[PDB]
Amino acid sequence: MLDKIVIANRGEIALRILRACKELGIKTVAVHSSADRDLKHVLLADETVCIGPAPSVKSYLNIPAIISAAEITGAVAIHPGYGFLSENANFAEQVERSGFIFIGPKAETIRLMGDKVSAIAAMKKAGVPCVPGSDGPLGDDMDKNRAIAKRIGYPVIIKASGGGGGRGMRVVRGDAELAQSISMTRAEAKFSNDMVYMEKYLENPRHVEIQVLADGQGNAIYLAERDCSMQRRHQKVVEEAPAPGITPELRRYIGERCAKACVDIGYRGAGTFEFLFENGEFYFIEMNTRIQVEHPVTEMITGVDLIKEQLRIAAGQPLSIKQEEVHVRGHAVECRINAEDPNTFLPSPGKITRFHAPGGFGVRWESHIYAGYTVPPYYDSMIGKLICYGENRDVAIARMKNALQELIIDGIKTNVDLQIRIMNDENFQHGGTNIHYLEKKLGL
Numbered sequence: 001m002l003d004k005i006v007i008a009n010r011g012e013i014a015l016r017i018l019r020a021c022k023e024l025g026i027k028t029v030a031v032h033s034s035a036d037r038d039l040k041h042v043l044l045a046d047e048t049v050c051i052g053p054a055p056s057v058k059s060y061l062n063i064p065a066i067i068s069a070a071e072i073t074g075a076v077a078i079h080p081g082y083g084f085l086s087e088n089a090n091f092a093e094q095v096e097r098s099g100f101i102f103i104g105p106k107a108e109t110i111r112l113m114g115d116k117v118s119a120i121a122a123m124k125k126a127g128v129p130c131v132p133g134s135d136g137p138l139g140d141d142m143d144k145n146r147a148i149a150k151r152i153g154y155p156v157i158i159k160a161s162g163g164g165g166g167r168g169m170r171v172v173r174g175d176a177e178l179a180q181s182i183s184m185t186r187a188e189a190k191f192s193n194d195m196v197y198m199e200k201y202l203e204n205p206r207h208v209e210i211q212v213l214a215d216g217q218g219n220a221i222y223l224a225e226r227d228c229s230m231q232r233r234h235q236k237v238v239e240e241a242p243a244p245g246i247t248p249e250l251r252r253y254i255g256e257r258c259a260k261a262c263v264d265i266g267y268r269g270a271g272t273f274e275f276l277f278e279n280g281e282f283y284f285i286e287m288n289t290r291i292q293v294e295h296p297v298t299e300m301i302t303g304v305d306l307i308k309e310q311l312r313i314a315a316g317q318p319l320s321i322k323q324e325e326v327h328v329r330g331h332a333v334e335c336r337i338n339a340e341d342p343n344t345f346l347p348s349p350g351k352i353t354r355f356h357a358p359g360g361f362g363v364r365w366e367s368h369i370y371a372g373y374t375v376p377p378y379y380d381s382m383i384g385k386l387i388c389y390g391e392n393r394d395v396a397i398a399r400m401k402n403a404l405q406e407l408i409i410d411g412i413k414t415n416v417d418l419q420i421r422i423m424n425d426e427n428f429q430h431g432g433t434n435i436h437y438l439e440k441k442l443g444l
């Protein structure tokens with residue numbers, strides 16, 4: 001058991017991690033910005049350290065301040081949660097070099113999977129199915145680039161190797177646009193890294209992703225999949241597990257290839273392989289080398305506490321859970337709750353004047369918010385996650401509708417009414433909508 005850890009994050013995930021720590025008897029240190037003194041998890045933590053002012057560069061991305069916090073409190077480990085420094089290989093390195101356990105993968109693994117070109121090469125070698133592509137960086141010889149395009153078959157997509165957040169990529173539908181599309185992506189994505197690659201452009205994929213756990217001692221398991229196709233500006237809005245239409249046989253096929261890839265790259269901890277799924281086929285696009293926001297839907301359908309497993313792995317324990325003990329049962333849906341004007345979709349901070357959480361069988365509310373809590377203007381819009389589990393998908397969705405109606409968040413604007421609309425959407429109710437659906441539905 002880890003004696004004491006620094007929770008190097010904020011909001012709902014910081015509270016998520018604190019709960020897992022409390023369950024396991026692990027002492028907690030909440031590092032926070034000066035704008036986050038009233039966070040629920042900070043108020044519940046055993047120790048707290050204000051690591052700097054509101055701007056993340058001097059708080060949640062402040063590597064020296066976070067490491068000093070660990071030093072002053074005599075912590076043994078640091079959990080980076082998601083976002084912020086979780087996939088910063090320099091942070092991981094410095095954490096370990098400074099004498100602390102980094103609750104995540106090795107820095108080399110973060111680098112390997114953090115660069116898209118190197119990540120694709122490793123997956124291709126490991127036998128994970130990848131999107132047909134250039135399999136390496138593009139030069140500026142445009143006879144050669146037109147040849148790669150022909151081999152792949154248009155339409156293709158130009159992607160920045162250091163790209164992220166839906167930025168640094170251009171869809172190319174023919175030769176005439178190829179030259180300019182490569183040159184501009186090479187500029188627009190100069191993220192500082194000019195390196196671009198070419199992928200086949202999949203025109204109606206679903207987002208299907210595979211959860212893994214690996215102990216970094218040779219054992220790896222997969223915990224089924226999630227469908228996260230309901231997106232806006234490439235940002236996920238609803239997630240569910242398992243993915244509609246995925247058979248046990250298909251699940252086992254892609255699951256086993258991901259688990260094997262973990263062994264090949266010496267992966268350690270929780271991670272997620274993200275695929276575009278189209279015409280019954282999986283195509284690798286990215287590995288998130290950290291816990292994911294939507295991890296709860298997988299927890300609901302497998303019974304596995306993913307955060308507690310992260311902590312056990314970090315403590316140096318081998319996986320106790322064998323693959324044959326992992327069973328998909330029932331179905332779960334997650335609705336992200338955002339402090340945003342639904343129409344303009346940009347953050348809406350302010351004091352919550354009335355709050356009521358939903359309850360009931362299968363209802364799980366993941367949020368730091370409370371009545372009188374002020375949502376600050378500085379950080380991400382997501383203030384909570386509503387997760388509903390049922391014996392089947394219909395029951396999960398029915399419970400989500402019921403839970404969303406009970407959820408009261410007054411004083412700020414939220415996307416609750418939108419989540420109600422998505423739950424009531426006939427195509428969502430059928431299932432299997434693609435990554436373009438929500439924007440088409442809304443008019444975006």
Ligand SMILES: Nc1ncnc2c1ncn2[C@@H]1O[C@H](COP(=O)(O)OP(=O)(O)NP(=O)(O)O)[C@@H](O)[C@H]1O
Nearest residue numbers: 131157163164165166167199200201202234285286
């Ligand atoms: N080969 C492809 N075909 C179709 N769409 C793609 C392809 N590659 C990326 N995309 C789009 O880009 C989205 C995800 O990008 P996002 O995570 O916002 O930033 P990114 O990490 O730079 N790109 P990615 O590598 O796809 O995760 C996908 O959900 C697709 O909509």
Ligand SMILES: [Mg+2]
Nearest residue numbers: 113114287288
């Ligand atoms: Mg990445």
